[PDB]
Nucleic acid binder design. Structure first.
Ligand code: ARG
Ligand code: MG
Ligand code: MG
Ligand code: MG
Ligand code: MG
Ligand code: MG
Ligand code: MG
Ligand code: MG
Ligand code: MG
Ligand code: MG
Ligand code: MG
Ligand code: MG
Ligand code: MG
Ligand code: MG
Ligand code: MG
Ligand code: MG
Ligand code: MG
Ligand code: MG
Ligand code: MG
Ligand code: MG
Ligand code: MG
Ligand code: MG
Ligand code: MG
Ligand code: MG
Ligand code: MG
Ligand code: MG
Ligand code: MG
Ligand code: MG
Ligand code: MG
Ligand code: MG
Ligand code: MG
Ligand code: MG
Ligand code: MG
Ligand code: MG
Ligand code: MG
Ligand code: MG
Ligand code: MG
Ligand code: MG
Ligand code: MG
Ligand code: MG
Ligand code: MG
Ligand code: MG
Ligand code: MG
Ligand code: MG
Ligand code: MG
Ligand code: MG
Ligand code: MG
Ligand code: MG
Ligand code: MG
Ligand code: MG
Ligand code: MG
Ligand code: MG
Ligand code: MG
Ligand code: MG
Ligand code: MG
Ligand code: MG
Ligand code: MG
Ligand code: MG
Ligand code: MG
Ligand code: MG
Ligand code: MG
Ligand code: MG
Ligand code: MG
Ligand code: MG
Ligand code: MG
Ligand code: MG
Ligand code: MG
Ligand code: MG
Ligand code: MG
Ligand code: MG
Ligand code: MG
Ligand code: MG
Ligand code: MG
Ligand code: MG
Ligand code: MG
Ligand code: MG
Ligand code: MG
Ligand code: MG
Ligand code: MG
Ligand code: MG
Ligand code: MG
Ligand code: MG
Ligand code: MG
Ligand code: MG
Ligand code: MG
Ligand code: MG
Ligand code: MG
Ligand code: MG
Ligand code: MG
Ligand code: MG
Ligand code: MG
Ligand code: MG
Ligand code: MG
Ligand code: MG
Ligand code: MG
Ligand code: MG
Ligand code: MG
Ligand code: MG
Ligand code: ZN
Ligand code: ZN
Lengths: 110, 116, 101, 53, 77, 141, 69, 181
RNA sequence: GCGGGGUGGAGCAGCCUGGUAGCUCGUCGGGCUCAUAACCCGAAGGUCGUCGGUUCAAAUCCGGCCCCCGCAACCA
RNA sequence: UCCCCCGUGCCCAUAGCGGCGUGGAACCACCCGUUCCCAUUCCGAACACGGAAGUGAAACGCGCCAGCGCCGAUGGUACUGGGCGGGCGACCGCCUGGGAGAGUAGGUCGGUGCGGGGGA
RNA sequence: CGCCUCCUAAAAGGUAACGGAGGCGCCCAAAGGUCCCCUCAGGCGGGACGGAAAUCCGCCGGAGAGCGCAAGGGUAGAAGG
RNA sequence: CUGACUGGGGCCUGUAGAGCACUGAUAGGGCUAGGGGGCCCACCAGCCUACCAAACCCUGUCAAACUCCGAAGGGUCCCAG
């Protein structure tokens, strides 16, 4: 018996894997916001970035943008360039949107 | 639904306006106007809120009205019908109670004629 | 063992022994030779269930207590043949397919 | 198609040529169709109007 | 005496057209079907009538993923 | 007499009568049984006639269990028509019966009373029969 | 909330017929009511209002005990 | 958030009394008011009145909140009802508006009811919620006799975080819900 | 076999186009007459042969079954 | 490499329903507000933002119980590719290779890959 | 008498009979494209007019609903709203 | 040298059999809305049913257009004779 959350999550993710790109998935909790780029072909995380691991500060939006840049910098160093944005159950807006725009600013391709 | 559960007709004289309440005729209307000292000839659209709250408070406390009065009339008949007395039979067949003729007339207790 | 002769049986009825035994969880050392059941109070048409089964020590019911176990039912009668034969049967209707179903 | 469900043409409002054929219900959609379609003559999208077939 | 029956429709010749281990080219039809009995997998697209067709040159593979249904894959060569 | 109250489909292909019974091969209600020895389509007219024989024997008493039901529609074209012009009309219903099935069971009657009633009913049937009583083999099923 | 579609709630004063004033919020600041919880017969314990009768029937005759015995 | 009479009463007199009477080991196990959902099942506005905005305007005064429309989920011959027809209103009052409504309902409306002999005790969900029905909208103070064209009642749903009827019965009576038995 | 019907007590509409049962007669009540017929003024009564189905809803569309009308049943 | 949590897959109910128990340091959650981004066919319920007083009550995670759900042998059997016999038939047997379903015994209140946060 | 669905059809495809059963000769300007949300039938309980069924509240409910129309396949991790 | 046929290997399938989880059928019993019937009432309910019986549960079964299951075989590609 699924929930609007689960279905929303599923529906947008299936759509992403179909295109077969590396996926920049984003979890966003009440305090923190994490992000990993995954190869669903192999079932393997390739590059990580999070507020909790970067010990970052105040405004969650401004924080996100920073973890976004963090992810992109670590990313390009690995040869990863293009990627697909898994917005999960979260509307592309605010914190999540900011994380994306940060990844873009950092030179990530999506 | 001002007093007492019924909203008495405005633009009419206060004595008659009270008769539109269940439990109050012209009689109990002449009473509550002295016992509260209000002019019987004035309109309800001309009543002081003071005159209002007094007439209301008195009438709801001195007499049994609307739903409760209807309740006892019902309760009074319910028992007469239940004890098995003649007064109860006439309430159970809907026939005239007060010893009138039933050969003709009696149209108010029965209802419109059912010809044959 | 259905000990006793039901009153329904005296009226001509028949004791239909639905369960002639019952499923039970129990110790191997604890196996009863049988289990008695009083059917003497059975009328047409009354019945007992596994709930009404009074058990020996150490044996536990493995079926629903709601499970019916025996009943007393009316007997065949030739008087029924005449009225059973007089019962006229209407044709079998059809569950339809398509714009009817 | 039918008596009420008609067939029609779409005429590029700029060069006046007919570029598409389709259908509509003239009881449900009594107004002349307006639709943006790619005109091969003009080589760009253009508003096309319903015109009698 | 007559009947209201007597009709039927042209057989539609549906089913799997390439089985697992078979080499296919880009565009080869793999499964013909009504609805999704098989679902498009790796390197496999689906047409407007649920037709499964190879997206790349390679070899076909089937995998049955339980409650997720059956899937058809083309493995690049 | 015995027939379905309704069905999805009116006419049924004839099928085949190969093999031993599918199930229903053990006593399950009464004390004594009547078992089919060879396959047949047993008509509703026969079943009822076989029943009536038994209740008539018991006069009053006993209980009759009928463990077969005619749900198969029997078809037949009108007299003197030629082949073709569709399938025939339904003229009765039969119960498909393969060797080994307990068709009838009696209960609540003396042994000699059951032996005779099942024998008599046996004569109304278009097949060979065998009378059987409840065993532990039946209990274990 | 959505703007412009909703009635504005402001501090309010519902005045009862017993003189009671209720501090609340409403779409209208002043209201006069004929009754409240503080004077309604069902609320105020069990004010018998006007019918403190006690049935009164059927033994309520006693008119009288003067008959012969 | 506005401090309101009935709300403050919940935390000061109602909250503790319940922890006493039932003995909860956690602060959230205590009964809370979830939401009050007011529904005007109307349907008198089917064909006849496409105009029932008076009732929306009325409910907007009562609850300080504009209701939404409810429409027919399926067509029905007997009610002269085709699928998708607008037959009712429903406003969901939560938080401070939920309190404000109940406060005015408990202190003013329920009393102004004709022959009000107490709310029905047995109208309890079983799952710990309560529902009650009014026959007039004149019961509310904001609605004078002048601004009413025709009578219309409503359904009131009160949802509780309570698991059982008894806990639900307590919370509401403590808040001031009068029952007949 | 092919076509057509079954609806107040009688005889016919309504069906094709789904929602909305109508006309004459008869019937009951009352007028006029000594009374009666005629005549005048009022009113009642059909869940549409059934069983199933389509639909939001069936006298109405569709199917099964009963019954009645008409035509056909040839070369052989 | 071992333990706990947050992510994300895989296997696709031995992983589920119900019952009980346990966890808030950290993480997650509910939670505190609705100024601001954004939002409600009404509702800050949801989505969203800014926060960090509280609580692990709901949720979720981890355990335990076989009442239900799910898995399920071995054995026998039905059926059968192929080879043969029998009956007037409906049908019935033999050899050889394959071999169910039901049921029985029994199993199960998950397993595992990658990445992070914490601990030893 | 052409076309569609199911069975007959003997577990690939195909397979006949005046064999068993139903449909089509339209439709939709949204009933189409995309993006973003939303999840049914039914059952028990609760609620003015309100009824077996109008709208509201709660719990249970893997899909038995829905998908314009026959049937089948499909399908809520949507193709449904 | 690719052929019929054959050895191994993968993949597709819904028949034989069987099953009742879906759609229907179904005998008996249990439990139990609905009627029918009787004592009982009009004042609104009772109560008993050797009556017809819904849904559900149990025992036992039926189906070309039912399938929770499901062979032997069969089709096809690869390597080999
Ligand atoms: N091994 C086999 N394939 N046997 C075939 C079974 C059928 C065969 N006609 C018989 O009666 O036995
Ligand atoms: Mg993996
Ligand atoms: Mg009066
Ligand atoms: Mg007199
Ligand atoms: Mg008299
Ligand atoms: Mg004929
Ligand atoms: Mg024909
Ligand atoms: Mg064909
Ligand atoms: Mg074609
Ligand atoms: Mg053909
Ligand atoms: Mg075909
Ligand atoms: Mg296939
Ligand atoms: Mg496409
Ligand atoms: Mg494989
Ligand atoms: Mg693959
Ligand atoms: Mg025969
Ligand atoms: Mg035949
Ligand atoms: Mg001839
Ligand atoms: Mg023939
Ligand atoms: Mg025939
Ligand atoms: Mg026959
Ligand atoms: Mg048999
Ligand atoms: Mg014989
Ligand atoms: Mg068995
Ligand atoms: Mg609190
Ligand atoms: Mg209750
Ligand atoms: Mg609750
Ligand atoms: Mg008012
Ligand atoms: Mg004919
Ligand atoms: Mg007639
Ligand atoms: Mg006509
Ligand atoms: Mg018409
Ligand atoms: Mg006359
Ligand atoms: Mg004379
Ligand atoms: Mg005359
Ligand atoms: Mg009908
Ligand atoms: Mg419908
Ligand atoms: Mg009908
Ligand atoms: Mg009609
Ligand atoms: Mg007909
Ligand atoms: Mg000639
Ligand atoms: Mg996890
Ligand atoms: Mg659990
Ligand atoms: Mg705890
Ligand atoms: Mg904490
Ligand atoms: Mg703590
Ligand atoms: Mg603001
Ligand atoms: Mg600001
Ligand atoms: Mg805004
Ligand atoms: Mg919030
Ligand atoms: Mg949120
Ligand atoms: Mg907890
Ligand atoms: Mg969560
Ligand atoms: Mg827990
Ligand atoms: Mg264990
Ligand atoms: Mg098994
Ligand atoms: Mg074996
Ligand atoms: Mg052979
Ligand atoms: Mg054999
Ligand atoms: Mg063999
Ligand atoms: Mg062998
Ligand atoms: Mg097995
Ligand atoms: Mg388990
Ligand atoms: Mg994991
Ligand atoms: Mg790890
Ligand atoms: Mg670690
Ligand atoms: Mg054609
Ligand atoms: Mg076929
Ligand atoms: Mg085939
Ligand atoms: Mg087939
Ligand atoms: Mg074949
Ligand atoms: Mg081919
Ligand atoms: Mg739209
Ligand atoms: Mg469409
Ligand atoms: Mg669409
Ligand atoms: Mg519902
Ligand atoms: Mg209800
Ligand atoms: Mg009611
Ligand atoms: Mg209702
Ligand atoms: Mg469906
Ligand atoms: Mg249709
Ligand atoms: Mg060679
Ligand atoms: Mg070759
Ligand atoms: Mg070859
Ligand atoms: Mg080979
Ligand atoms: Mg092979
Ligand atoms: Mg078979
Ligand atoms: Mg079944
Ligand atoms: Mg069973
Ligand atoms: Mg068979
Ligand atoms: Mg079978
Ligand atoms: Mg078949
Ligand atoms: Mg079959
Ligand atoms: Mg299996
Ligand atoms: Mg299985
Ligand atoms: Mg095989
Ligand atoms: Mg082969
Ligand atoms: Mg070779
Ligand atoms: Zn142009
Ligand atoms: Zn007061």
């Amino acid at each position: 018996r699924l929930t609007a959350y689960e279905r929303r999550k599923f529906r947008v993710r299936n759509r992403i894997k179909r295109t077969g790109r590396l996926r920049l998935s984003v979890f966003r909790s009440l305090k923190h916001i994490y992000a990993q780029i995954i190869d669903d072909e192999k079932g393997v995380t390739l590059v990580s970035a999070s507020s909790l691991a970067l010990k970052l500060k105040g405004n969650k939006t401004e924080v996100a943008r920073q973890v976004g840049r963090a992810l992109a910098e670590k990313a390009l160093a690995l040869g990863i360039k293009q990627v697909a944005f898994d917005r999960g159950p979260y509307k592309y807006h605010g914190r999540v949107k900011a994380l994306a725009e940060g990844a873009r600013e950092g030179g990530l391709e999506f | 639904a001002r007093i007492a559960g019924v909203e008495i007709p405005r633009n009419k004289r206060v004595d008659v306006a009270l008769t539109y309440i269940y439990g109050i005729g012209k009689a109990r209307a002449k009473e509550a106007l002295e016992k509260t000292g209000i002019n019987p000839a004035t309109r309800v659209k001309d009543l002081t809120e003071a005159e209002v709250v007094r007439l209301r408070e008195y009438v709801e406390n001195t007499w049994k009205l609307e739903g409760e009065l209807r309740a006892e009339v019902a309760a009074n008949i319910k028992r007469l019908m239940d004890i098995g007395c003649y007064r109860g039979l006439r309430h159970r067949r809907g026939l005239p109670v007060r010893g009138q003729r039933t050969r003709t007339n009696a149209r108010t207790r029965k209802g419109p004629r059912k010809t044959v | 063992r259905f000990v006793g002769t039901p009153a329904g049986v005296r009226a001509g009825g028949v004791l239909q022994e639905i369960h002639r035994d019952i499923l039970v969880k129990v110790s191997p050392r604890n196996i009863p030779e049988f289990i008695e059941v009083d059917v003497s109070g059975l009328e047409i048409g009354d019945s007992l269930h596994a709930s009404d089964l009074k058990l020996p020590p150490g044996v536990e019911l493995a079926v629903s207590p709601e499970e019916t176990i025996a009943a007393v039912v009316p007997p065949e009668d030739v008087e029924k043949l005449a009225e059973e034969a007089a019962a006229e049967v209407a044709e079998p209707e059809v569950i339809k397919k398509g714009k009817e179903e | 198609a039918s008596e009420v469900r008609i067939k029609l043409l779409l005429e590029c409002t700029e060069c006046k040529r007919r570029n598409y054929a389709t259908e509509k219900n003239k009881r449900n959609t009594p107004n002349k169709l307006e639709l943006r379609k790619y005109c091969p003559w003009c080589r760009k999208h253009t508003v096309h109007r319903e015109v009698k077939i | 005496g007559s009947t209201r029956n007597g009709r039927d429709s042209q057989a539609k010749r549906l089913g799997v057209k390439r089985y697992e281990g078979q080499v296919v080219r880009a565009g080869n039809i793999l499964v013909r079907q009504r609805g999704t009995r098989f679902k498009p997998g790796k390197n496999v697209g689906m047409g407007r009538d649920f037709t499964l067709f190879a997206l790349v040159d390679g070899v076909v593979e089937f995998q049955d993923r339980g409650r997720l249904g059956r899937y058809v894959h083309v493995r690049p060569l | 007499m015995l027939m379905p109250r309704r069905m999805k489909y009116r006419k049924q292909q004839r099928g085949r009568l190969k093999g031993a019974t599918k199930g229903g091969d053990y006593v399950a209600f009464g004390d004594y049984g009547l078992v089919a020895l060879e396959p047949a389509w047993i008509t509703a007219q026969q079943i009822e006639a076989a029943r009536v024989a038994m209740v008539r024997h018991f006069r009053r008493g006993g209980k009759i269990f009928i463990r077969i039901f005619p749900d198969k529609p029997y078809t037949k074209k009108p007299l003197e028509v030629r082949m073709g012009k569709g399938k025939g009309n339904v003229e009765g219903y039969v119960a498909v019966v393969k060797p080994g099935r307990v068709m009838f069971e009696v209960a609540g009657v003396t042994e000699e009373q059951a032996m005779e009633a099942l024998r008599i009913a046996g004569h109304k049937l278009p097949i060979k029969t065998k009378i059987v009583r409840r065993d532990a083999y039946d209990e274990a099923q | 909330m959505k703007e412009g579609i909703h009635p504005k709630l402001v501090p309010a004063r519902i005045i009862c017929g017993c003189g009671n004033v209720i501090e609340t919020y409403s779409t209208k600041p002043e209201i006069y009511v004929e009754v409240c919880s503080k004077c309604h017969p069902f609320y105020t314990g069990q004010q018998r209002f006007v019918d403190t009768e006690g049935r009164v029937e059927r033994f309520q005759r006693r008119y009288g005990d003067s008959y012969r015995k | 958030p506005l401090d309101v009479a009935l709300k403050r009463k919940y935390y000061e007199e109602v909250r503790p009394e319940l922890i006493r009477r039932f003995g909860y080991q956690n602060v959230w196990e205590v009964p809370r008011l979830e939401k009050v959902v007011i529904n005007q099942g109307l349907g008198e506005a089917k064909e006849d009145a496409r105009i029932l905005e008076k009732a929306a305007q009325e409910l907007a005064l009562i609850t300080g909140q504009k209701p939404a429309v409810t429409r027919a989920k399926k067509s029905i011959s007997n009610f002269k009802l085709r699928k998708g027809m607008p037959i009712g209103l429903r406003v969901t009052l939560r938080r401070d508006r939920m309190w404000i409504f109940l406060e005015k309902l408990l202190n003013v409306a329920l009393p102004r009811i004709r022959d009000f002999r107490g709310l029905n005790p047995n109208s309890f969900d079983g799952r710990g919620n309560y529902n009650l029905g009014l026959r007039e909208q004149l019961i509310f103070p904001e609605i004078t006799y002048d601004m009413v064209d025709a009578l219309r009642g409503m359904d009131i749903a009160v949802v509780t975080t309570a698991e059982t009827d008894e806990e639900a019965r307590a919370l509401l009576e403590l808040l001031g819900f009068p029952f007949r038995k």
